[PDB]
């Protein structure tokens, strides 16, 4: 009759049940604290990060989407309501081509303009007209090239000094500059920079042009024709200089100066006689007068190749090990179900 | 008689509670791993994200707050220490207005300057002086317009050829350009672009001006006056051209050339005679010389209205199902309390 | 291009060019507008996008003073 032992064994079992309940209560409190941390503080922090990211993205996307408007505003602010040329943000290439197509000219002029869009842009400009709300109103002013493919020639001169018993007579042509033949007259541009060369095409400025008779051509055959009063300036004191020509140079050497043809690296090639002399770009590379050295062509120097630094991604995603949690959770669930089945079996077996 | 059955039931019961405790300890290990993961590996990532966001914000805010300084630096770097005008970042509008109010001139001049701020800016400029530490030092040079509201007139000419037995005699005026009346003399500007027109006001350049006698205006009444040597150039060969006027054009037609006014949609409106004829910008639209067609006015073309793409927010806040978890936790606490109370009842009953 | 030396007057002429002369002006009118930008109400105080928008509006207000819009 050892029933007293089982009368205390169940009491110890009940005490163990109470201890397990206290332990699981402490576990529940810890779980509650962790859940209150993660659901409130971490979620608030990540929401704040999301809001800041959205703000940054809106700022950069605003810049990217309004790039053209921002660029035109920046240029007008820089130049105080004007732009020196038609920039690529003032007018796109398709718009420029359409505008050139709609111009009141002929097919050849339209084709040449579509070839020399760059000169079109650099001879046009844009002006700021007003601001309405969040808008800017401006007008682009495109040039219309109605005259194309007529002869043009450029004139350069140097003093022409002749010595007689120490008495000089220097003659200099004053016709220097650009000439382009037009209808009814020839247009004369006294300054070289008045017309700009692109390939074989010469784009001249209307404001600087001077209309002269077609008979100005005879100045290039006989400088003293009675048909046309060629404009020359006379002198008495010698002048020594080098006048650069598009395919060469004119060098005048008189009185006490020492002019000579040279080629840089090696140096002197030949001394030059007194008077006027014409040297081509293929003959030499420099002209020296006294101690002054003039270049004939551009001195081609170094060539550089610079590449920008690389940019790389820094995306390192974080992956959660779900499997090791799932196996343990299935283990605890199956343990709980087995415990329920065992207590049910105990209740069933207790009765006869 | 069933004490053996009671013993067996107790043994199965304690086996069940031991299995439940083992499950509880496995769950405790799982939640320990979850807590350590959340506390270390996720908090480190969120701190790194916070640091990166702070860096991005600092860069953007630097760009936004130092915008005027950066724009001035950019402009001076682009033009190498010079700026072609007084930009809106060199000098704000309030500073420009204060400086205009402080100039040593009169109220009318000051008022006209505050009206023509744009010409003030475009005729001024700024130069770079030096760099000290993290600072840029520059000077802004403003124009002082002390003479206002005096008569100004512009003169344009075309060749004037006459024929005698086929021998021509052409005359051209060289007084072309801008004139403005001043004290003691008249200022003459030979080039049209020497003075810039805004409304009815002409802003002229001091460097290009040439002071000339007040008696130069008699060239506009009789060129052959002995009271003034009007600047004319004679010729012998004919010249055909069209000189564009502010409100019209001068067209000269001579010798073997054919000139006529017309439009851009229809051809000939009228054939012009030989000599100079003056055509206003309302009479026609174009002038044709031989095959060359000159426009009288600006050809107003298309009008465009372009709007940028919209910008939208991508903020999607996250949220947790708090109510279900709280209900489950309260149920856990109430169930464990009920189990403790009822096991206490059983222990008290066992006596 | 062909260049000739003119010995009688110490000059040169370079021929072979082709003219392109302007005879008129052709104009167009453009209107550029800022696209729509929405509220971001989640932020606190100085939003970066709102600062950008205020900067753009102030720049537009300054630009209005240099227009031909009398």
């Amino acid at each position, epitope marked *: 009759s050892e029933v007293n032992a089982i009368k205390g064994a169940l009491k110890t079992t009940n005490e163990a049940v109470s201890t397990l309940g206290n332990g699981v209560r402490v576990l529940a409190t810890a779980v509650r604290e962790l859940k209150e941390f993660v659901s409130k503080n971490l979620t608030s922090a990540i929401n704040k990060n999301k809001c800041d990211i959205a703000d940054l993205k809106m700022a950069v996307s605003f810049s990217q989407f309004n790039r053209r408007f921002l660029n035109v505003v920046r240029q007008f602010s820089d130049n105080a309501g004007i732009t020196p040329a038609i920039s690529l943000d003032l007018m796109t290439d398709a718009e420029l081509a359409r505008a050139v197509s709609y111009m009141p000219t002929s097919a050849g002029q339209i084709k040449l303009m579509l070839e020399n869009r760059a000169m079109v842009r650099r001879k046009g400009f844009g002006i700021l007209i007003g601001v*309405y709300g969040s808008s800017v*109103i401006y007008m682009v002013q495109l040039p219309i090239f109605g005259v194309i493919d007529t002869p043009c020639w450029i004139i350069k001169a140097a003093p022409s000094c002749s010595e007689k018993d120490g008495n000089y007579a220097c003659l200099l042509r004053e016709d220097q500059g650009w000439y382009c033949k037009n209808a009814g007259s020839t247009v004369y541009y006294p300054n070289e920079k008045d017309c700009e060369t692109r390939g074989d095409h010469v784009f001249c400025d209307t404001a600087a042009g001077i209309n002269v008779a077609e008979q100005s051509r005879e100045c290039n055959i006989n400088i003293s024709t009675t048909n046309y009063p060629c404009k020359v300036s006379t002198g008495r004191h010698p002048i020594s200089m080098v006048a650069l020509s598009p395919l060469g140079a004119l060098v005048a050497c008189y009185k006490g100066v020492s002019c000579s043809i040279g080629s840089n690296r090696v140096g002197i090639i030949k001394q030059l006689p007194k008077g006027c002399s014409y040297i081509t770009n293929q003959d030499a590379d420099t002209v020296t007068i006294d101690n002054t050295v003039y270049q004939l062509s551009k001195v081609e120097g170094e060539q550089h190749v610079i590449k920008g630094r690389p940019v790389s991604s820094s995306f390192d995603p974080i992956r959660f090990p779900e499997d090791q949690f799932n196996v343990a959770l299935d283990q605890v669930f199956e343990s709980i179900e087995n415990s329920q089945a065992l207590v049910d079996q105990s209740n069933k077996i207790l009765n006869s | 008689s069933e004490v053996n059955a009671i013993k067996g039931a107790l043994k199965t019961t304690n086996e069940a509670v031991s299995t439940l405790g083992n499950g509880v300890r496995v769950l405790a290990t799982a939640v320990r791993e979850l807590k350590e993961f959340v506390s270390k590996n996720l908090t480190s990532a969120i701190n790194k994200n916070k640091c990166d966001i702070a860096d991005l914000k600092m860069a953007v805010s630097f760009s936004q707050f130092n915008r005027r300084f950066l724009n001035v630096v950019r402009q001076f770097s682009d033009n190498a220490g010079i700026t072609p005008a007084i930009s809106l970042d060199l000098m704000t509008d309030a500073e420009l207005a204060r400086a205009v109010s402080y100039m040593p001139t009169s109220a009318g001049q000051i008022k006209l300057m505050l009206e023509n701020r744009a010409m003030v800016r475009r005729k001024g400029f700024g130069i770079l002086i030096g760099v000290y530490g993290s600072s840029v030092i520059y000077m802004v040079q403003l124009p002082i317009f002390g003479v206002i509201d005096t008569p100004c007139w512009i003169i344009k000419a075309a060749p004037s050829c006459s024929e005698k037995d086929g021998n021509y005699a052409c005359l051209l005026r060289e007084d072309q350009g801008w004139y403005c009346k001043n004290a003691g003399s008249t200022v003459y500007y030979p080039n049209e672009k020497d003075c810039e027109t805004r409304g009815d006001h002409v802003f002229c350049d001091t460097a290009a001006g040439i002071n000339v006698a007040e008696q130069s205006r008699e060239c506009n009444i009789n060129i052959s006056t002995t009271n003034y040597p009007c600047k004319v150039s004679t010729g012998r060969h004919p010249i055909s051209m069209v000189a564009l006027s502010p409100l019209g054009a001068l067209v000269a037609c001579y010798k073997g050339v054919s000139c006529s006014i017309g439009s851009n*949609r229809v051809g000939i409106i009228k054939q012009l005679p030989k000599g100079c004829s003056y055509i206003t910008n*309302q009479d026609a639209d174009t002038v044709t010389i031989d095959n060359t067609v000159y426009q009288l006015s*600006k050809v*107003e073309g*298309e009008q465009h209205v372009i709007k940028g793409r919209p910008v939208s927010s991508s903020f999607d806040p996250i949220r947790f199902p708090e109510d279900q978890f709280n209900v489950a936790l309260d149920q856990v606490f109430e169930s464990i309390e009920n189990s403790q109370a009822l096991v206490d009842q059983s222990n008290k009953i066992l006596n | 291009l062909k260049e000739s030396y003119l010995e009688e007057s110490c000059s040169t002429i370079t021929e072979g060019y082709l003219s392109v002369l302007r005879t008129g002006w052709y*104009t167009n009118v453009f209107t550029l507008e800022v696209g729509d930008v929405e509220n971001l109400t989640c932020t606190d105080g100085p939003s970066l996008i709102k600062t950008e928008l205020d900067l753009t509006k102030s720049a537009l207000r300054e630009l209005k003073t240099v227009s031909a*819009d*009398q």
Partner: antibody
Amino acid sequence: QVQLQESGPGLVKPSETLSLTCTVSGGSISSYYWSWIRQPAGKGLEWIGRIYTSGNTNYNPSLKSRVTMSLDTSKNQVSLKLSSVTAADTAVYYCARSRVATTPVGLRDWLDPWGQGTLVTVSS
Amino acid sequence: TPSLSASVGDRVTITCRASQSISSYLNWYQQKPGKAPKLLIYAASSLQSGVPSRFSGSGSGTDFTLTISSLQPEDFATYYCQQSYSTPLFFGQGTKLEIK
């Protein structure tokens, strides 16, 4: 969208200096071109003139010596002034937008939209 | 002005002719009594946005035609053709539609 409205005296004495105003809202008067059209009672439409962004004008040759048009960007208005009005100048006056845009055939221009108009009566 | 009488659902063809060829520089307008003209057709073949599709434009050069396929009681108005070839802008004399 751009909408327009006309305002004026309504009754003008002979040989006076009739003035009308069209007020543009929803857009800017510099972004487009503008026109005036008048239609007498029981008669057809007569085009009067057009004004551009730059301020240039082209007038009907039957009214060019008596019509002045202008833009005022501060109030966003288009002004019309007809001097020396007689009884033959009585009509309903409309302001409208000149739209110049690309079409499948090229550059074409029309008048859209229109204003509701206003009646002007000339009598002694 | 020349008038036209037609019934509901009937096909109406309005024709106006230019002095010279103007390609496709022609417009159509619909004006109702007491209102302002409303553009219907531009460039002689383009249907203005908001206009019912029953209105059509055709022709090039000198002969242009406005056609309405299925007439409605709201279609009764006055129609003018205006040429955009050259200024001065000129409007057609107008064809008043009246009910039968």
